[model samples]
Every structure is written in structure tokens, then in C-alpha cells.
Target chain A: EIVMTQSPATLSVSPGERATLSCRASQSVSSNLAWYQQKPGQAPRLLIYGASTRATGIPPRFSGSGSGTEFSLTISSLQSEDFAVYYCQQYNNWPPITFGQGTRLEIKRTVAAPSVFIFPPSDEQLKSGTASVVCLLNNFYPREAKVQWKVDNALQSGNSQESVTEQDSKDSTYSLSSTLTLSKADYEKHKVYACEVTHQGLSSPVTKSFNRGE
Target chain B: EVQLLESGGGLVQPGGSLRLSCAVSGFTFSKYAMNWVRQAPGKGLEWVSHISGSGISTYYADSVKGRFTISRDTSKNMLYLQMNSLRAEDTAIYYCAKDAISGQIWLQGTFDYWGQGTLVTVFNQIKGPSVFPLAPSSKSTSGGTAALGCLVKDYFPEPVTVSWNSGALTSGVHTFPAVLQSSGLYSLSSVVTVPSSSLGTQTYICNVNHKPSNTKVDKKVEPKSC
Candidate 1:
């Protein structure tokens, strides 16, 4: 028995809109695939079996498709009661049945792009000759973002990012802060140290730069 | 470096059976899966089947389910395919490809190592071309012009002709080359452009004539709203 993987650990979709969840098996599972829906405080209910066939009492809006290694469960339109966790299980290897990590489908909201900011190296670190810069991305929705550091348009390597993610309790937005370390000589030689952020809500990647020798 | 050589291609009578062989070297045969893909000439590549690294299980395509079998000879470092009930449409170049590991339990990626294809031809069966659904080009419809395309595939002999209903009224016409599909058949596409204003008021049609089969296809071009 091999592992099964589910994508988009959490799905944020609006009510009345469609949602499709993916499940991939490490090996061919044939049609021995099954889908389950779980709500808080309730046991998982079978939604589909034999890959694409809906289980008894399942509504037409809930459907499954695909075979072998790849499968999907699609909700034609999200309803109030449909906000829950879904998982895919494979019985091809009866001795060791495999289950995918569950996918959480929750309520949606308008996407919010992160506002990027860059903080120059601190004076103490600069004086010590080992300086560092900070990149802060705030107010992003959907909870996923990527960060990269560049020096004067050239990509930097051998740098570790300190990831600090915090969620806003009021609107459930997300904020992430990262830092990159560099030698003070390199920082002063390179005029621009940029923090580039990519988010799902942004049409283009946002970059914030800290300038030296000002 | 991996090496794969496929051998086994010859003429087969319609309804006969054939076995193909792929020999491998420079890699452990038991550690990677093997896949079988075929192309009929001008058509797209079609995946037929695959055998896992351990040679414990084999998966066949839906089109070849009952009649195809994939097996490996670990000791001989070779993979073999036994295909039965072959038809003229099954004529294609059969390629054996090795699967690359997915950094996980099962083998995943395809064509990491592949063989020079073996040609399989089935003779004496006359088949006519089949037409795909007629559709309009969305990109062309935006600028006050509508371009409709027709695809005709799976025909034997390769000598076929396509025509549009608006042959004289069309602004332009392009007939693509009739390429042999990996399935051992021929396929081609033809597009006809007309004024966007003519849509909804005038109807368009496509016709295909295959000389050997004396077959003809007439399909109306149904354009969807832009």
C-alpha cells in the first residue's frame, strides 16, 4: 500500500460557488477509491465509491471522477452544510488501506494582497560588520505567500528566511515576516536589497527595497 | 545513462496478435517501471499500458483493456507486450519508455528513458476517417471574424480531401497536413474563416472524402456565442 496525497490543505471557497478537491495516489489504485466528508463532531460520511459513483443518499451536486492514480471530488455548488473536511481512501491493497490527508473547505472572502515593506539593517549589526534586513508582508488573504531576496536585481543564495506568520483574529487575514542576513561590506556595496513577495491575490509580484549609501 | 531498444515490428494480418519487445541496459530493470506508448502517424501519442518496477502489476489503457498484456523479464532485462485482436486502426509506432521515480513510493514521471519506436502495421483492413466535433476558434472570433476548425482522424491510406461549405465565400482557408497518427491512421485539421457578422444568420459545413473507402463525412459547423 502506498501513500495518498490531497492538495490545497485548506480550500477557501464562497457559498454557491464550485469546489473541486484533488487526490493523488502513489500507485495505481484502480477503481477502489472512496471519498468521505467530515464535519465537526461528526464521523466521516461516504460521498463516493468506485471512483466516480455516488454513494447512496448522496446528492447530485456531489460527484466524483477519475481512476487509477488521480481522482477528484467536486461539489457543484457549496452549501452551508458543505463546509467541512474531505478525504480520499483507497482499498486496492486491502491489507493496508491508504487514506489521503484531509482537505478543509471553509467559507471564502475577498482576496487581499499583502502590503510589502522592507526594513534596513540595524545600526548595531552594521557596526558589527554583519548586517541583516527584514522583509514584512502583511494583510494577505488565502494564507499562502512566497518570499525571495535579491541584491541589485541579482538573486541571492545561501540565505535562510526566518518565517513568522500571524493571523488576524478579526478578519482572519495573514501576515508573514522574514529576515535575511548579509555581511555589512556586501550590504554597503550593493545599493539595493529587495524583498520580493508573490501572493495568490496579487496580479504581479510586489517588491520592497532598502537602499544604502543614502 | 539509460539505454532502451525496442524490437518487434512487422506486418500483421487484421485480427491477428503481435508481441513487442524492449530490451534495456545501464540501469536496474527491477527498480523502475516501464510504459508503452503508441503513435498512429499524424495523431497524438496514446498511452497503452505500464508495468511496475517489481513487475507485480500491470495497467492497460481503456481502449486496450481485454486484449493487451504487459510483462517484464527481469532476468533478461526486457519488457514485453502481447497485444491481440489487432485492427488496422491499431497501426502505430509502439515506443517503450521508462518511468522516473517521483521521490516517493510509486514510479511516476514518464519518458525518462525511451526506445526508438517499433512500427506495427496491420494490413488488408479498409477503414474510413472519423470527424471530431466542429468548433469555432475563440481567439479569431474577437476581431469581427469567425474561424471554424474541423478535425478528421483515424483513416487508412492517408489520401483524403477536406472541403468547407463556404469554399467560395470564405475569407481564407487552411488545410493542415494529413499526418499519420500514432494509432497507425491519418489525421488532419482544416479551418475556414468567415465574417463574424455571418454567424447566427448563415450556416457553415465541412466535408471529408476518403478515396479508398469511398466514404464521405458532412458535419455542420455549430459556432458558439463569442
Candidate 2:
């Protein structure tokens, strides 16, 4: 598997600020590069490829760079809706390839250190368990971030989750939290679980995993 | 529009191997999937697999799964496939295909467009001239068995045949697995037991039937006199 390394797990930017992200490959790959923007409750949209060419029907503000081995995806002007997560993929080999872990773009805010947590089912929970999982993203600046729980890597249905925001004066960071519940125990057998946090154009979702007992 | 143009060399030496390639063009490497297919000189087509721009892949069938692979040169939009361990039956024309990720199946039947085709053959030949062998001695026969082998090489999405003829003996025929090699090469092989009595003067043939090209090659063996 080709290893992709993305920098700055989280980023802070003011309105109209120019944001730049990087995705580096461990091996040499030609121009087979693509970028993606993923929002809450939606599939990822392809952004750019061939290193610099933009995908059809994409906004003009997004751009890409670099050649073999390393590449970058940049957002020219930070828009209110562009605050989600961004990822890069390289299609230089086969077995189907993917991107760097992910990068979260956040607007300047004050709150808790918004985080998403995952919980696995326990032996007792499995015996009589309907495992429901929730995600929380605290300390969001805009006070309008969202959180959700995913089953086996996919978004779950009935996402009636809600978020609450708090402001932090000292760090100027905003904290946000959201929760989702699942009533099925079958998910416990899945080796991994994920939680996604969203806030407007902040596409990068902060995800955490839960592994049931071996 | 996106397209892939593949071409490569092939070998046809008894018990030898072959290589081929699919050079891509037009489409950005990341936008489309490249596929490979095999057709014996006169047989049906078989799905191989897709080579994503990311270099990750999934196989179409299990038999040739281990023998195939795809790689690309992103700068030039070129994709490549490679195969080894060839036999006489492995002689067939191979093709490179272009497909979309969301639309096509992994292998069995998800090909879109294919390359023209390239052929490779494997025929038996003596490393050096040696005295013909006579009545077989257990010691001599056991030691020489390793040198007596034939390979079948051909590409598919076309019909081809591999028939074993023992000069007055029953002929054994069969077709090869369908998936195209990673290098866009199609190949197949089979082993036949040579009768002790005919070992000193027996001959085997690997014939390939392709459009505009009907080719055939024969290998002769002479057992060691005991």
C-alpha cells in the first residue's frame, strides 16, 4: 500500500484567508493525483487531478500542484461553506488507491477542544446489547458545527444528532459537540467504527474508531 | 475523451517467458480505469482487472491472479502489465482496455474498449546439439526429465488452440485461463507425458491460429541410448 501523509491535522483560518494543504507520497508517482472535498451526510466530491486539472462541475477556487512523489491542493479564497475536510489521492499503481488521512479547516473560534470519540461494544453489551454510538465536536469557533456516528465506515441513517457550542476566551477556540445513537449490535462485530464532525465549509471530519474486544 | 494505446514485445521459445505493455494516452491518469483482456488465437474473451490511477488493483479471476500486475507512468499517462511462467498454450494476443471506475465490474465482464492485440509464442528447442538417446536407462531418464518441457503462449478475446500430438498417439487439447496478463500479454501452458518407446524419436507441435497470421512451430527430442 502507498503511504500518504497529510500535514496539520487541524488548521485555523480567518474569513477570506488563503488556505493551503499538502499531501505527500512515500514513493514516486506521476501526475495521477486527485483531491476531494467531503461534507457531512454526503459522498466525497472529486476536486483536481493530473496534478493541476480540475474535475468537471467543481468550483473554480480550488487548485492543485506538484508532480511526481509530492502534491498540494489549495483553496484560493476561504469561503464560508468551504470549511470541511480535504484529502488527496494518487492513482499511479493498482488495487485501488486513496488519500492522506485528512485535514480539517476551521474558522477562528473559541470553545472546547472539540473532539469525536468512538465506543465499541462490550461482551455484556453484545449479550443484550443494541450498540448505539455518538460523536462530539467541542470548541468550534462558529458555534454551528455538527457531529455524527458512522457504522463500519459509512454514514448511518436517522442522523438526528445535535450540536452545542461554547466559547473559550483564552485560546479563542470554539467548542462544539454532537451525538448519534445506534440500536443494532451487529455493528459491534465490525473491527472499526468512525465519528465525523462537520461545520459548514469545514469539510475535514475529525474521525475516531472503536474496536470491539478481540 | 480518454484513451489508452498499448504495445509491447512477445517471446515464443519452448519453455520460455513473455512480456507486453499498455501505453496510455488522452485521459488524465486519475480520471479513468485501465483494463486488460486475453483472447486465445481463436477463443472467447476473459476479463482481467482495472489498474486505477493510484496503482491499487483487484483481480478478475484466481488462476492468473498471481501472474498479473499493472503499473503506470503518471507523467506520460502510460499503464503497464507484466506476466511470466509461460507454456506453449500461453500463446495468445493480449489487449488493453479503458473503463470507468463506477460503471464497470472488477473483471468478469467490465471491459469497455480494447487495444488491437499482441501475440507471443513459446516453442521447444535444444540448448545444444547432442547425440540422440536410445533405450532409456532409469538413471538417464530421471535426470533428463527436467529438460523436456513445452510452453503455450497466446493472447485472447480471440480463439486459439493447444493440441498435443505424439506422432500416432492420442492428441490432448485444452484452452487457457481467460484473464489478460498485467503487461497486456495472454498466455497458457500444459504438460504431457512422453511415452518411453517414442522418447528417442518423438516430436511435439505448438500451433497458433490468428487472423492474418497462421503460425506453427515444432520441437523434436531424441532420448539417450542406454
lDDT, candidate 2, residue B38?
58
lDDT (tens digit, per residue) of candidate 2 on B1-226: 4455557745556544455777666656666666665555433334455566455654543445666565666677676766666655556567676653543333212233456666665544312111111112232234333122233333433334434453343332222233333334343332233444455456544333433234444433333332
**Each prediction's TM-score against the native?**
0.37, 0.33
Model 1 Cα lDDT, one tens digit per residue, B23-96: 99999888887888776743334568877788887777667889889999999998999989998678888888
True contacts kept of each: 0.00, 0.00
Whole-model lDDT, model 2 = 0.52
Q: What value does the lDDT take at residue A81 in candidate 2?
A: 84
Most accurate candidate by TM-score:
1
lDDT tens readout by residue for model 1, A115-177: 665656545447757555656565678777889898899997666344433334356566555
* Interface RMSD per candidate (angstroms): 25.0, 28.2
Give the i-RMS of model 1 in Å: 25.0
TM-score of 2: 0.33
Per-residue CA lDDT of model 2 for A70-169, tens digit only, reads 7888888889789777877666753434457778786675434343333333223335444434333433455556566666667666643343332333
Model 2 ranges off by over 4 Å: A111-214, B1-226
Give the range where candidate 2 chain A is weakest over 10 consecutive residues by summed lDDT.
Answer: A116-125
